[PDB]
Amino acid sequence: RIKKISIEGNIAAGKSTFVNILKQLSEDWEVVPEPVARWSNLTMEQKNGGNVLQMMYEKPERWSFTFQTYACLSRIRAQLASLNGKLKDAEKPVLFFERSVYSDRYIFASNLYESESMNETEWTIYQDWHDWMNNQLELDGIIYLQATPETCLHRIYLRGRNEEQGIPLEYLEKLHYKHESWLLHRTLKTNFDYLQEVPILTLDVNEDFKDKYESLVEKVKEFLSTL
Amino acid sequence: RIKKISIEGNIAAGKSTFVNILKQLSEDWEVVPEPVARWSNLTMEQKNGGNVLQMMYEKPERWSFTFQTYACLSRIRAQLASLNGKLKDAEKPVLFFERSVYSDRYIFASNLYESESMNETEWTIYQDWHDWMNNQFGQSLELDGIIYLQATPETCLHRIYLRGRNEEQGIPLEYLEKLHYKHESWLLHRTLKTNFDYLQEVPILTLDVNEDFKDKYESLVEKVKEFLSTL
Ligand SMILES: CCCc1sc(-c2ccc(OC)c(OCCF)c2)nc1[C@@H](C)Sc1nc(N)cc(N)n1
Ligand SMILES: CCCc1sc(-c2ccc(OC)c(OCCF)c2)nc1[C@@H](C)Sc1nc(N)cc(N)n1
Ligand SMILES: O=c1ccn([C@@H]2O[C@H](COP(=O)(O)OP(=O)(O)O)[C@@H](O)[C@H]2O)c(=O)[nH]1
Ligand SMILES: O=c1ccn([C@@H]2O[C@H](COP(=O)(O)OP(=O)(O)O)[C@@H](O)[C@H]2O)c(=O)[nH]1
Numbered sequence: 144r145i146k147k148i149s150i151e152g153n154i155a156a157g158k159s160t161f162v163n164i165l166k167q168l169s170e171d172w173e174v175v176p177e178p179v180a181r182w183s184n185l186t187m188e189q190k191n192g193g194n195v196l197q198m199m200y201e202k203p204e205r206w207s208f209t210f211q212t213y214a215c216l217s218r219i220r221a222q223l224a225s226l227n228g229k230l231k232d233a234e235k236p237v238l239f240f241e242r243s244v245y246s247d248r249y250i251f252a253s254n255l256y257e258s259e260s261m262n263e264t265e266w267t268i269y270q271d272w273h274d275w276m277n278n279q280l281e282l283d284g285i286i287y288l289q290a291t292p293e294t295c296l297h298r299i300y301l302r303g304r305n306e307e308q309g310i311p312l313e314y315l316e317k318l319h320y321k322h323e324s325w326l327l328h329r330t331l332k333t334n335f336d337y338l339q340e341v342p343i344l345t346l347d348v349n350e351d352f353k354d355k356y357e358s359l360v361e362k363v364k365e366f367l368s369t370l
Numbered sequence: 371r372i373k374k375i376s377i378e379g380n381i382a383a384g385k386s387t388f389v390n391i392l393k394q395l396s397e398d399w400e401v402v403p404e405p406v407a408r409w410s411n412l413t414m415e416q417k418n419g420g421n422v423l424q425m426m427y428e429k430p431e432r433w434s435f436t437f438q439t440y441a442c443l444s445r446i447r448a449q450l451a452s453l454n455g456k457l458k459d460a461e462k463p464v465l466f467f468e469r470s471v472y473s474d475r476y477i478f479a480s481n482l483y484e485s486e487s488m489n490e491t492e493w494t495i496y497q498d499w500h501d502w503m504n505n506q507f508g509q510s511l512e513l514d515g516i517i518y519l520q521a522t523p524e525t526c527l528h529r530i531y532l533r534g535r536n537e538e539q540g541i542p543l544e545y546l547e548k549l550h551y552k553h554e555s556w557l558l559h560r561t562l563k564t565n566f567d568y569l570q571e572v573p574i575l576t577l578d579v580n581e582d583f584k585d586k587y588e589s590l591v592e593k594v595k596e597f598l599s600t601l
Contacts, residue, residue: 195495198491264425
């Protein structure tokens with residue numbers, strides 16, 4: 144009954160700006176934020192999330208498996224809980240996930256394996272881990288907030304985490320092409336077949352929508368009407 | 371309907387041997403060997419296990435978190451596969467688990483932590499994941515019982531050489547004494563304060579297996595059978 148839509152995009156591309164605006168326009172809409180975004184700050188998960196992230200910055204090749212695995216759990220935990228304990232007696236139910244378990248694996252984990260930050264056994268253990276848990280949160284559509292690396296880079300400054308001032312354009316750039324293929328070009332191979340058929344919607348967020356978000360919202364309601 | 375009984379011991383207790391002995395004595399009686407033993411011998415799980423098992427040996431403070439999470443994840447899946455594809459239509463089906471999710475954590479992973487092969491953050495993550503893989507997926511796995519095969523750490527080392535796996539040949543001693551200690555701390559004194567409420571209610575057949583039992587096991591099985599009727 145509840146619709147499940149993933150908001151997807153690059154770092155600082157506006158996913159969080161979009162979801163904060165969407166939550167407020169309808170009684171019947173709620174968002175599940177990125178737990179990785181909360182770790183950039185505190186309870187068990189917050190400290191654990193705190194440390195693993197920082198360790199990742201110093202030495203990705205040592206910490207990527209651990210962080211990719213714990214990120215995904217934290218997200219799966221956090222989404223499941225919204226289903227089974229929210230949008231409780233609203234009429235036209237929609238949940239907006241900030242990124243997904245397909246992001247975790249097929250953008251993020253993948254990229255780390257391609258940067259040799261995960262060795263083969265870690266990558267293959269992570270996929271088996273990910274494959275088995277899944278078929279036991281499944282999406283009704285995906286919204287792609289599409290931005291260039293340059294836009295994202297500035298935005299990283301705008302909010303001003305220091306580790307991202309660090310984050311370089313070449314890192315943005317490869318995260319950027321991994322989105323086009325799954326989502327825009329539609330040709331990244333994946334182990335979850337229905338996501339070749341999952342309805343997708345793409346929005347340009349280069350322009351500052353902070354004070355001009357009706358054109359985007361209109362396309363979102365439009366999008367939801369066909370599902 | 372299928373009762374689940376964990377065989378817990380230290381390394382080279384004779385578990386594999388004994389579960390294998392029990393398994394031939396009844397058609398109501400099936401076994402789930404431990405994923406790790408299998409790796410210590412193929413599938414994508416073996417291929418992964420042999421690799422991470424081999425690295426675990428080679429640099430344990432890099433690979434302990436990885437190893438533990440995969441070994442436990444893999445146990446759950448075997449115990450599920452068995453507890454779906456075995457023993458329907460048995461009048462009194464019994465499933466004997468070669469080790470359990472609880473030895474994965476409170477004995478091996480805990481030990482790896484305490485021996486500094488995992489930092490706090492890894493051990494806190496593991497523990498979080500553990501509660502959660504078990505809650506979400508591992509509900510059908512609560513144990514009706516545990517059979518503790520208790521041998522002395524020395525009996526155990528004596529036993530390690532005979533099995534004679536190349537990789538295992540260099541396993542130290544003081545390890546065993548720490549494991550036994552946790553195995554005794556866990557399965558005799560019950561000082562170990564599990565987070566799993568129901569482990570305090572599950573009874574424990576403690577069996578002394580310091581005497582060789584491979585051709586002379588009838589009293590061992592008799593004890594199981596009376597324990598089994600008490601469940
Ligand atoms: C955003 C802050 C968390 C970090 S830190 C990080 C990173 C840090 C330092 C790095 O090199 C020294 C690095 O690249 C190593 C090889 F590229 C990645 N990537 C990331 C994410 C892009 S990985 C990630 N995985 C997820 N599953 C989810 C998510 N939101 N982010
Ligand atoms: C015997 C093959 C599996 C291995 S390899 C291993 C190990 C080997 C060498 C080590 O130091 C060089 C080592 O570090 C011990 C530090 F306390 C562990 N421990 C073990 C187990 C005791 S860890 C384990 N955890 C499980 N959950 C299951 C299982 N069968 N084994
Ligand atoms: O239309 C926008 C979208 C974002 N931002 C700013 O860009 C930064 C990063 O955006 P966000 O936190 O949404 O990034 P994401 O959630 O995509 O990582 C934040 O400081 C926002 O306030 C902005 O000024 N205008
Ligand atoms: O009563 C016994 C118990 C064990 N063993 C031998 O000791 C080693 C330990 O066996 P096992 O692999 O069954 O122990 P586990 O590690 O599975 O607890 C094996 O070579 C067995 O053949 C034996 O000869 N008599």
